[PDB]
Amino acid sequence: KPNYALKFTLAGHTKAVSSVKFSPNGEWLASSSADKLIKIWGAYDGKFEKTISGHKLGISDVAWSSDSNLLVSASDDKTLKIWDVSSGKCLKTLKGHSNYVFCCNFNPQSNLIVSGSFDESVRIWDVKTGKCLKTLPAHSDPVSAVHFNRDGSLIVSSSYDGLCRIWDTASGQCLKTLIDDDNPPVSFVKFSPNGKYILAATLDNTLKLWDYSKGKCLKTYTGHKNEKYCIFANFSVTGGKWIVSGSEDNLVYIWNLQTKEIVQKLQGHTDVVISTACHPTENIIASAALENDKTIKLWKSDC
Amino acid sequence: MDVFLMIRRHKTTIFTDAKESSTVFELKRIVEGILKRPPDEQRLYKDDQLLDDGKTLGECGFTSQTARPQAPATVGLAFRADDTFEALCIEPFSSPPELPDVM
Amino acid sequence: RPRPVLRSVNSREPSQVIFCNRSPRVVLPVWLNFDGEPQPYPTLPPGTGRRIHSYRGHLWLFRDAGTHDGLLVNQTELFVPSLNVDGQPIFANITLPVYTLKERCLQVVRSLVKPENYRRLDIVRSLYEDLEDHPNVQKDLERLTQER
Amino acid sequence: MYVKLISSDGHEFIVKREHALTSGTIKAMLSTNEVNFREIPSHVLSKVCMYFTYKVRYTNSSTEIPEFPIAPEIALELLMAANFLDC
Ligand SMILES: Cc1ncsc1-c1ccc(CNC(=O)[C@@H]2C[C@@H](O)CN2C(=O)[C@@H](NC(=O)CCCCCCCCCC(=O)NCCN2CCN(Cc3cccc(-c4ccc(N5CCN(C)CC5)c(NC(=O)C5=C(C(F)(F)F)CC(=O)N=C5)c4)c3)CC2)C(C)(C)C)cc1
Ligand code: NA
């Protein structure tokens, strides 16, 4: 069992914080917020580094390029933006979605961006030109999460229609769907770091670990509260192997991946913890909460 | 096509229904059932116009659009006994008081 | 005894409906969510109708949008979409109830008098209270609950 | 069968019995086939009878129902009468 304890609270945003992401080089934490701003903080000491502005409405998500030089943001203003982190420059504005853009991710090569929108499409974008390369509209309700696999050959998307969809990146064709006996909205999905599994959240207070090669659900994590908001979950693999997620009771929940036992509940936030992130090399968790809270918290553990 | 009527004489008003295809005479038969005067002792009117017994209510102007349950059309009634004809005479209803200030 | 929460069943089974406003009022459709809470939807002018997407087992009520007077749909208070058959939409025919004369009079007097002024009228106190007891979806929720 | 409802100012309104029995008050007063109202005047009672016709015609009719119109000048007295008649 880990012993995460609070180390820093980052109170720079003036509205709900929607997403926190550690840079792949481990140096930085990027936060996005309903206050239309991205902020960059020191990953280890929570020291404010810079503010990145340009979006006209609130921001739902941010993601780092593999070399930690670029950010992409997803916004209520229907656009994504590609930013140079060192300069804070908006390099590109990706236009094509017809409603709120909720989620975004680079592929490992970082030549592609995947996005997901309330307009029920997943889009694949060229980083160099900013042009939309493919639109995948098979989902029949808002797309809540998009993620590339380890080599970028697959995309997994989750949607309020109750499906996870695995897409072939090259062709755009949906290679597989994943769904249990019931169809609650799927609020979050991501490939495991190791590449073998997919972790999916549903709005029935449940996280599930799937063998997507076999279409088999391997594990199930409950005890938290998740019926309304799309809460980002994570694999923690730098020490022990944990599942980490926010919760609608304002806590961060940590489960043992194999036993599915809750091993920790981190208290401190005063609203829905909508986002969690796990540091790439150290046992550090970042968490972010909604409107009654507006802060990011950094927690650290020996394992 | 139904029509809804007020048949009015003096201080008496009969509420009844008929059809656009009903004749004036049929109306008189309805009236006879109630007031116990035969059709040949009745004259029916629309405004100041004596209605011909053989005309249908539609041919006289009573349509479903202007003779509604909630806003019936008025037929005047006057009686006749042998050689004495009673003139059409309908007493108006009371009048509402001055609309109150808060309205 | 626990009293049934009138609520939409979350069936996730789509149903296409024609909201037909056969009334002289501006109509506010009211959807009961899965928690039983009323949610107002866009309004329909008199004499108009709209094809709309809803779901099997969802619950709808219909009011006057300006006054919240209660209205009927297919001759009753609640509309529940079912499964479409043979590619045919489900009609939700929204009409005026036959109000009591008293309630219709209350409607007209309320439309003419500011609530603050009700008790200036030269009428008995119980008519003041009747005027002040404005139409309310919650009344119908409570009644239809006590009927089930 | 018909009944005669007589206004305070002496106007007689002859209406179908079934229509008049819309009002439980009128039913109590019928227990002659005539009812004398001591205070409801003719302009109000005529409107009440029109309401009776409208009510019986459109009740449970599965059709489009028109508004029952009430002029402002009559509304307060019509309210008083509808309350007394419980209709
Ligand atoms: C013509 C007209 N004229 C007369 S009438 C009429 C008419 C017009 C239209 C219609 C349409 N038809 C209906 O509406 C029918 C009628 C009736 O039958 C019901 N119904 C339905 O369609 C219903 N649908 C169904 O019955 C089947 C499908 C419904 C899904 C089941 C929902 C399960 C319950 C959960 C719940 O209760 N949610 C309530 C609260 N949520 C909050 C979010 N809302 C918005 C939303 C919806 C979907 C996705 C996301 C989403 C998802 C993910 C993310 N991010 C992902 C990445 N993270 C990192 C961050 C989060 C974000 N983003 C954010 O949340 C966000 C921020 C933050 F993260 F900080 F919050 C900040 C920010 O700046 N921007 C965004 C947002 C957000 C939705 C409600 C319903 C849609 C009304 C519910 C019908 C008639
Ligand atoms: Na009204």
Author numbering:
A (entry chain B): 32 to 334
B (entry chain J): 1 to 103
C (entry chain L): 58 to 205
D (entry chain K): 17 to 47, 57 to 112
Question: Can you provide the manuscript's text about this entry?
Answer:
The chromatin-associated WD40 repeat domain protein 5 (WDR5) acts as a functional subunit of the mixed lineage leukemia (MLL) histone methyltransferase complexes (1–3). WDR5 adopts a donut-shaped propeller structure, containing a WDR5 interaction (WIN) motif that binds MLL1, and another cleft known as the WDR5 binding motif (WBM) site that mediates protein-protein interactions (PPIs) with a diverse set of non-MLL partners such as c-MYC. PROTACs simultaneously bind the protein of interest (POI) and an E3 ligase such as von Hippel–Lindau (VHL) or cereblon (CRBN) and hijack the cellular ubiquitination-proteasome system, leading to selective polyubiquitination and subsequent degradation of the POI at the proteasome. Here, we present pharmacological degradation of WDR5 as a promising therapeutic strategy for treating WDR5-dependent tumors and report two high-resolution crystal structures of WDR5-degrader-E3 ligase ternary complexes.
Using the PROTAC technology, we first generated a WDR5 degrader, MS33, and solved the high-resolution crystal structure of the WDR5-MS33-VCB ternary complex. The ternary complex of WDR5-MS33-VCB crystallizes in space group P21 with one molecule in the crystallographic asymmetric unit. The electron density for MS33 is well defined and bridges WDR5 and VHL. One key difference was that, whereas the electron density for most of the morpholine ring of OICR-9429 was missing in the OICR-9429-WDR5 binary complex, suggestive of multiple conformations, electron density for the structurally equivalent piperazine ring in MS33 was ordered, wherein the ring protruded out of the WIN cavity and connected to the linker. Overall, the linker in MS33 was relatively extended and resulted in a sparse protein-protein interface between VHL and WDR5. The most prominent of protein-protein contacts involved Arg69 of VHL, in one of its two conformations, making hydrogen bonds and electrostatic interactions with the side chain of Asp172 and the main chain carbonyl atoms of Tyr191, Asp192, and Asn214 of WDR5, as well as electrostatic interactions between Asp92 of VHL and Lys259 of WDR5. Many water molecules permeated the VHL-WDR5 interface, with several molecules mediating contacts between VHL and WDR5. Because of the relatively large separation between VHL and WDR5, there were almost no “cross” protein-ligand interactions. That is, VHL interacted exclusively with the VHL-1 portion of MS33 and WDR5 interacted exclusively with the OICR-9429 portion. We observed an enhancement in VCB binding to a preformed WDR5-MS33 binary complex (α = Kd(binary)/Kd(ternary) = 1.66), reflecting that the VHL and WDR5 interface was stabilized by a few positive interactions.
